[PDB]
């Protein structure tokens, strides 16, 4: 392959194009590269901020016999994002904890458990 021989086939250049490659890159290498926009460090992932009885009505719909400790923090490979409050919202790690902090500021009692740190 010409990509192996380090040939520049870019279309604006020689008119050609490299043969083994996708025709549409939904995100190019640069913004795949930037992990800060993707992973969650230092960044809010749930944008809507709910009122008191909003929060209480959200908690109202979590099924009994549910603990927080059973929802693992997803790997770095996975995008960090939240849908707001949707069906089975408590299943989304980021939504669950974001909500938890919203409840903390609001003085809303938090019915679910808390995150357990297992140790050898």
């Amino acid at each position: 392959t010409p990509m192996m021989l380090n040939i520049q086939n870019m279309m604006w250049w020689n008119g050609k194009r490299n043969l083994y490659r996708a025709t549409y890159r939904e995100k190019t290498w640069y913004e795949i590269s930037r992990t800060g926009a993707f992973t969650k460090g230092r960044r809010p992932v749930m944008r809507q901020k709910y009122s008191r009885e909003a929060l209480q009505a959200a908690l109202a719909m979590v099924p009994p016999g549910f603990e927080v400790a059973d929802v693992p923090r997803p790997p770095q490979r996975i995008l960090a994002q939240s849908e707001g409050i949707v069906g089975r919202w408590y299943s989304n790690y980021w939504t669950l904890h974001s909500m938890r902090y919203q409840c903390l500021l609001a003085g809303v009692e938090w019915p679910l458990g808390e995150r357990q740190r297992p140790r050898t």
Binding site: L5, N6, I7, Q8, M10, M11, W12, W13, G15
Partner: peptide
Amino acid sequence: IHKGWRTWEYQHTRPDPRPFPD
């Protein structure tokens, strides 16, 4: 490609073919 051309110094636009079509 033994040595590559400097392609970063060009804005991306298609030049006209020198045996230009009529």
